[PDB]
Amino acid sequence: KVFGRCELAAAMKRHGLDNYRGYSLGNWVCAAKFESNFNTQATNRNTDGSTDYGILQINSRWWCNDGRTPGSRNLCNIPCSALLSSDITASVNCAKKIVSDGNGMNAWVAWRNRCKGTDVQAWIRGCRL
Ligand SMILES: CC(=O)N[C@@H]1[C@@H](O)[C@H](O[C@@H]2O[C@H](CO)[C@@H](O[C@@H]3O[C@H](CO)[C@@H](O[C@@H]4O[C@H](CO)[C@@H](O)[C@H](O)[C@H]4NC(C)=O)[C@H](O)[C@H]3NC(C)=O)[C@H](O)[C@H]2NC(C)=O)[C@@H](CO)O[C@H]1O
Numbered sequence: 001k002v003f004g005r006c007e008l009a010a011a012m013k014r015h016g017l018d019n020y021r022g023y024s025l026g027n028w029v030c031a032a033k034f035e036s037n038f039n040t041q042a043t044n045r046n047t048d049g050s051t052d053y054g055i056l057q058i059n060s061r062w063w064c065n066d067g068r069t070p071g072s073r074n075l076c077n078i079p080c081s082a083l084l085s086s087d088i089t090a091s092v093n094c095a096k097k098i099v100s101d102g103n104g105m106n107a108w109v110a111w112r113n114r115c116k117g118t119d120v121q122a123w124i125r126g127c128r129l
Pocket of ligand 1: 046047052058059102109110
């Protein structure tokens with residue numbers, strides 16, 4: 001599923017991400033936009049053999065199991081395929097653990113380089129929330 005900007009914002013809000021760990025909703029929508037262009041099915045391979053999955057490009061090196069990332073962790077306790085669902089619950093639940101692991105949203109490289117320090121509030125303009 002390719003979410004619309006405001007549709008995503010609402011699903012994210014619903015799932016408790018607005019201000020999760022002090023990160024306003026515009027942060028999460030901006031991260032999604034640049035990580036996967038709002039596509040739940042996005043997948044990208046890393047040079048170490050690990051793979052990033054879904055709307056928030058969660059890395060199999062640490063957060064999910066894809067049975068093809070030798071000696072990696074499965075911190076969210078889920079198969080990586082669960083992160084490609086049209087339903088973002090798994091993605092959001094796992095994101096919540098990631099953001100609290102010490103580095104905040106710096107865990108998301110697109111967030112750090114394209115969202116961090118910008119006017120993220122623009123990402124939720126005109127949405128009924
Ligand atoms: C090609 C490319 O760069 N692809 C991107 C993917 O790398 C990227 O996924 C992110 O990958 C980084 C590097 O593996 C990963 O960051 C690591 O995350 C762990 C887990 O939290 C950190 O370890 C913790 O460190 C803190 C602070 O030191 C400790 O207190 C804590 O105990 C540690 N946790 C554990 C379990 O040991 C690492 O410090 C950190 N490594 C680096 C180099 O920063 C991110 O978690 C990955 N992000 C996500 C969302 O999965 C992917 C996603 O945007 O983007 C690809 O393009």
